[PDB]
Design a protein around this nucleic acid. Structure first.
Ligand SMILES: [Zn+2]
Ligand SMILES: [Zn+2]
Ligand SMILES: [Zn+2]
Ligand SMILES: [Zn+2]
Lengths: 54, 54
DNA sequence: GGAAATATTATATTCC
DNA sequence: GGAATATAATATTTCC
């Protein structure tokens, strides 16, 4: 239903989607590259980052 | 000095960077996937998309 | 310097 | 269901 981020007002599809959005305001970045120590917000963004390391 | 959008006031690094942004207003999508026919505003985004077909 | 490419990132869309 | 994936758009780096 309405997965409201009660700080920006925006709506989201899942309970995980809104949760992934929460780390915009908090700034968690819970996934770190094994090669360059870069922190990323989502597992998917860290993956596509791994293509600088070819 | 700058290259700011007539329409949303965002400003960009270069002439070419502003042209790319303005495509979000015009809906201009010059980069067309030969497989599925989908269109993209940037050459870079089409090439990422190309790798989704295999 | 500036076009171009690349890296980046927030979030819809996908998929049985 | 909800993680993987694809998208849109901008920011940074590369390249001549
Ligand atoms: Zn929010
Ligand atoms: Zn890395
Ligand atoms: Zn604009
Ligand atoms: Zn395609």
């Amino acid at each position: 239903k309405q997965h409201g981020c009660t700080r920006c007002g925006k709506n989201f599809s899942s309970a995980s989607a809104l949760q992934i959005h929460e780390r915009t305001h908090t700034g968690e970045k819970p996934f770190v590259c094994n090669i360059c120590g870069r922190a990323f917000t989502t597992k998917g963004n860290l993956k596509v980052h791994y293509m600088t390391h070819g």
